[PDB]
Paper text:
Compared to typical mammals which express multigene families of classical MHC class I molecules, in chickens only the BF2 molecule is well-expressed and is the major ligand for cytotoxic T lymphocytes, while the BF1 molecule acts as a ligand for natural killer (NK) cells and is relatively poorly expressed if at all. The overall structure of BF2*1901 retains the common characteristics of MHC class I molecules from other vertebrates including chickens: the extracellular region of the BF2*1901 heavy chain folds into three different domains; the α1 and α2 domains form a typical MHC I peptide binding groove (PBG), which contains two α-helices and eight β-strands; the RY8 or IL9 peptide lies along the PBG, as shown by well-determined electron density maps. In particular, the large residues Trp95, Arg111 and Tyr113 from the β-strands on the bottom of PBG of BF2*1901 are replaced by the much smaller Leu95, Ser111 and Asp113 in BF2*1501.
In addition, peptides from avian influenza viruses were predicted and the influenza H5N1 virus M1 peptide IL9 (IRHENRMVL) was found to bind BF2*1901. The structure of chicken class I molecule BF2*1901 complexed with MDV peptide RY8 was determined to resolution of 2.0 Å with two molecules in one asymmetric unit, while the structure of BF2*1901 with influenza virus peptide IL9 was determined at 2.0 Å with one molecule in an asymmetric unit. The Cα atom superposition of BF2*1901/RY8 onto BF2*1901/IL9 generated a root mean square deviation (RMSD) of 0.533 Å. The superposition of these two structures showed that the most distinct portion of the two molecules is located in the middle of the α2 helix, covering residues Glu145 to Tyr149. For BF2*1901/IL9, the loop at the middle of α2 helix is closer to the C-terminus of the peptide, compared to the structure of BF2*1901/RY8. Furthermore, the relatively smaller F pocket of BF2*1901 can accommodate the peptide IL9 with PΩ-Leu, which is never found for BF2*1501. Meanwhile, a π-π interaction can be observed between P3-His of peptide IL9 and the residue Tyr156 of BF2*1901, which may partly compensate the weak binding of P3 side chain out of the BF2*1901 groove. Interestingly, in the two structures of BF2*1901 we determined here, the middle potion in the α2 helix of B19/IL9 shows a distinct conformation compared to the corresponding position of B19/RY8. The superposing of the two structures showed that the different secondary anchor residue of peptides RY8 and IL9 lead to the conformation shift of the α2 helices in the two structures. The large residue P7-Met of peptide IL9 pushes the Tyr149 out of the peptide binding groove, which is different for the residue P6-Thr of peptide RY8.
Numbering used by the authors:
A (entry chain B): 1 to 98
B (entry chain A): 2 to 270
C (entry chain C): 1 to 9
Amino acid sequence: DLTPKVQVYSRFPASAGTKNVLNCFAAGFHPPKISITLMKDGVPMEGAQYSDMSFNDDWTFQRLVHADFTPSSGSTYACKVEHETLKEPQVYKWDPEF
Amino acid sequence: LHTLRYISTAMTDPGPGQPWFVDVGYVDGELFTHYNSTARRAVPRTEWIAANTDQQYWDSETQTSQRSEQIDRDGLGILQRRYNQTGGSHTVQWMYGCDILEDGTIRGYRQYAYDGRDFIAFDKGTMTFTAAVPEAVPTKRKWEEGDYAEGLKQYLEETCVEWLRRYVEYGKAELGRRERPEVRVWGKEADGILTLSCRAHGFYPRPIAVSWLKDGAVRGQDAQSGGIVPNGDGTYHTWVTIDAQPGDGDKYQCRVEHASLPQPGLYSW
Amino acid sequence: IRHENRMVL
């Protein structure tokens, strides 16, 4: 078993009020069953799309989750991941970089 | 130079409401077809494959995938018994395809993993199947006595290559495009350390070199990279960080080398 | 195209 390695990032360099896409990419994990949820202000974000199960050259599994969003200052965004290698959900915060 | 890869995953425990069998194909690293055990249809996943195929093409792909599904459905039980396991979470994966290298040589492969670890692979050059574990010897023996190597070699050297060359032409405009990244340098100070980040958003094709420079000279000490990760739209993303002294931000530049940039890009915080 | 084969484990 391999724990997921997770990155959270937006499609475009972000600015408040500008339409964007929020991405959460989990990779390197096994078994393939995994929960990956994009969050805004502690609440699951609407509109999320999930890649079909796939894996890398080394057989480890990966999944991209993405949702359209318009970042707002004084909101926080994150990706919450559950996997059987983890004893509790892991929350990865998005850095807006603005 | 060009690659055609088909992969599949068969799972005993995909999760609630999720398909236990998922098969996907890639041309030059781009997803262009998909099948799973829930919809039970092989479908196009790019406009360029859809525009250049007909219903008979997808009916044939679907037939192939449904056969693969029934074989791997039973394979899950077969290997659980081979390994003296009772139930639990288990997976069967395979990947196969062909590569056209830059000089014009061709490679072909077909390999399997059980529970994420190598199980067996085709050795096309000797027309044998290479067992990676003792548990794969019964499989090797059956496939070698059954002369499956003949048809597999023909698929990998002829069919796979012939169709890969077509797919690359169908998708020439998309696969051959270049998209310039949007690059942001950002800084955060904490614990007396300035961590500088450089993120390249939305580049295509995938290869890229992103480096930190200090007073003009390249620097890798205490630099870290997240590697290349995908966007929803087929472009790519990467970030690189470096730790600096507070107040030294003006001395650093991020350099981006990419096929879309005839001259490498330099960026300041 | 995908390889239609009957290789069973």
